């Protein structure tokens, strides 16, 4: 279920205590707060305090991100807004200074390594002619499409006493005019009339000889990566010197802005400060303790809440019992129910682990899964976060206890189905005659020989479809019920209409996959399709005429407990049997190779397949059941208690 909620709302005859009320009302956290009538309380001095605290918050998480950190909570910073700003300001200034250095080292290196190739090309195209006392050199870049325009411009402007050396490279030409010292101005005018100019080398290096300029780009491009390594080391050291201070200071600032933002949601007047908020009924004892100290001024009571009106407004939080709580991980990310709708969480522990056991159905695989449960239990026991950066996976040790609880339910059903099928690494105990059947009888009779397809397929196909019938009909019964619980007849008719149509479709199929009879099937079929055509004309939901084929396919969709189980079973068997080929053909080396090759192939196909075996069970809940009672049709308001960011440590 979702937890039952009620409205709290303290009032009184004096204004000034309301900040002390908010303080105790965040030390115990139980209340989600709306605006009590509308938001109309603030002061310009309270705005100035809120600006300074939200500046400390933003400046702390900004400088944490410059340091490459994340804004997790810590022990709160001990005292004073003035000390908060005086602690933050020198740290933020150092972090921004090291990032400003890093950005300019990046920009210098980037520009140097671009110009370095054409400068080396032109410095190799030259022979030290730049350093000549008697003549002069003009560097530029061009393309072979237009080099004749430059030769013509020089021919017209100067009396063929120039030179023009060149070399091609990817996408262009390195070009080098040479002239007598008087004529460089004429060469610059000639190039300008060809749409060309001297190549401006990036820095003040434009004043240096070309062969003297190229050396500086080369040494700076070689040296700057070492200076990047130095500023990265200094910025990492600054993080070690200041992370714990920033973490504490960001934690403080979060709580201060939470109180000062929440202060706007009070109603206000001639005496009162009236607050409002939804509270869980199991949480009331803490609200009582938070307000009992303030009975010198407050008056309060808890009002019952209507499920009909405000249903989009009341918050939703879940309250399952301890055997069902871990299975919230499989459902709470999909949607948040509306208040007074159904919570499907307790249906997850009863069907998901049972279908996983039916699919896998191997005692040898169940023991490999049990050894993963023992491994995860070590992180819970030591209180270590699991980290696997390949997946960006981090699990806090409290979440690993949720996974281990679910995995123990999956192991249990996999061993009991593994004795029903007589399966332990496929065929291994059945080669040994520990498990057997009348073809080669053994110590333990196999209850359902899963791979004896001509004997067992009809049993396992009907048994798979029977779960499909049961949950599809239960989800449609929930839709009819939740329609009546709100007098919403458009949901009632859709629920009972699809139910009657599915009874009609099944009674038709049963009467054709066999023999017809009057009383048990041919009557009930016409009642089924009669209730369907009625519910369409009553509701005027014309999407029922298309979607009845969708609903009938969701029953047949459950034959994936047999199909993926039997695909897993035969493949595991033949890998074992390939082991016994090596063991029977050869001597003691064959018993070693047979064990080794079978083990390597089993581990590989247990890696490739198992996430598929976990996924096929859960999605039968997620679409073939949850879409029946309308789980996705509306979103409830998430429960968001007024709390400290410190998470109660």
């Amino acid at each position: 279920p979702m937890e039952k909620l009620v409205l709290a709302g303290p009032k009184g005859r004096a204004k000034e205590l309301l900040q002390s009320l908010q303080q105790a009302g965040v030390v115990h956290l139980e209340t989600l707060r709306p605006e009590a009538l509308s938001a109309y309380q603030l002061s310009p001095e309270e705005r100035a305090e809120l600006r300074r605290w939200e500046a400390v918050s933003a400046g702390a998480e900004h400088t944490l991100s410059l340091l490459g950190l994340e804004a997790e909570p810590a022990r709160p910073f001990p005292e004073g807004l003035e000390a908060a700003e005086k602690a933050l300001s020198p740290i933020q200034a150092h972090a921004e200074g090291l990032t400003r250095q890093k950005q300019e080292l990046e920009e210098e290196l980037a520009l140097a390594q671009a110009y370095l190739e054409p400068l080396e090309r032109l410095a190799a195209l030259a022979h030290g002619l730049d350093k000549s006392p008697f003549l002069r050199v003009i560097p530029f870049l061009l393309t072979e499409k237009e080099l004749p325009l430059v030769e013509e411009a020089l021919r017209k402007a100067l009396e063929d006493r120039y030179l023009l050396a060149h070399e091609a490279y990817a996408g262009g030409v390195a070009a080098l005019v040479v002239v007598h010292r008087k004529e460089v101005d004429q060469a610059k005018a000639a190039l300008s009339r060809a749409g060309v100019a001297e190549l401006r080398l990036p820095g003040a290096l434009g004043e240096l000889p070309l062969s003297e300029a190229a050396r500086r780009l080369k040494e700076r491009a070689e040296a700057a990566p070492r200076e990047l390594s130095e500023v990265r080391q200094h910025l990492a050291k600054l993080a070690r010197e200041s992370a714990s201070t920033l973490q504490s200071l960001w934690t403080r600032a979060q709580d201060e802005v939470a109180r000062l933002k929440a202060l706007e949601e009070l109603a206000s007047g001639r005496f009162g400060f009236a607050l409002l908020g939804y509270v869980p009924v199991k949480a009331k004892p803490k609200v009582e303790e938070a307000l009992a100290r303030h009975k010198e001024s407050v008056v309060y009571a808890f009002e019952p809440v209507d499920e009909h009106h405000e249903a989009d407004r009341i918050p939703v939080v879940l309250d399952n019992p301890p055997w069902a709580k871990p299975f919230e991980l499989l459902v709470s990310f999909l949607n948040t129910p509306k208040y007074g709708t159904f919570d499907p969480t307790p249906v997850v522990p009863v069907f998901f682990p049972f279908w996983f056991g039916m699919i896998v159905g191997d005692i040898g695989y169940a023991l490999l899964f049990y050894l993963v449960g023992r491994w995860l239990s070590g992180y819970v026991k030591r209180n270590e976060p699991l980290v696997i950066d390949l997946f960006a996976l981090k699990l806090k040790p409290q979440v690993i206890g949720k996974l281990v609880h679910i995995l123990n339910w999956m192991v249990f059903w996999t061993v009991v189905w593994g004795v029903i099928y007589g399966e332990f690494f496929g065929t291994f105990l059945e080669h040994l005659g520990v498990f057997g059947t009348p073809e080669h009888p053994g110590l333990i009779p196999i209850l359902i020989h899963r791979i004896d397809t001509a004997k067992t397929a009809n049993l396992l196909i009907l048994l798979s479809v029977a779960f499909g019938v049961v949950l599809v009909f239960f989800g449609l019964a929930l839709r009819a019920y939740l329609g009546l619980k709100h007098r919403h007849m458009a949901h009632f008719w859709e629920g009972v209409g699809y139910l009657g149509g599915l009874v009609g479709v099944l009674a038709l199929a049963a009467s054709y996959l066999g023999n017809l009879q009057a009383g048990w099937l041919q009557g009930l079929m016409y009642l089924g399709f009669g209730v369907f055509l009625l519910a369409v004309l009553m509701s005027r939901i014309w999407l029922m005429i298309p979607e009845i084929f969708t609903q009938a396919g969701h029953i047949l969709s459950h034959i994936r407990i047999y199909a993926v189980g039997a695909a897993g079973g035969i493949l595991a068997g033949l890998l074992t049997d390939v082991g016994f080929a090596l063991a029977e053909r050869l001597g003691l080396l064959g018993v070693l190779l047979g064990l080794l090759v079978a083990g390597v192939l089993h581990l590989l196909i247990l890696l490739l397949t198992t996430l598929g075996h976990m996924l096929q069970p859960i999605r039968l809940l997620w679409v073939e059941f949850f879409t029946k009672f309308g789980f996705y049709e509306e979103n409830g308001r998430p429960y968001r208690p007024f709390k400290s960011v410190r998470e109660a440590q």
Partner: peptide
């Protein structure tokens, strides 16, 4: 060009002889 840089490279020897003559 690919040969024209070598023709200018030989022509730079007139600056080498002008420097070597003082």
């Amino acid at each position: 060009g690919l040969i024209k840089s070598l023709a200018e490279k030989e022509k730079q020897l007139l600056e080498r002889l002008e420097a070597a003559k003082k």
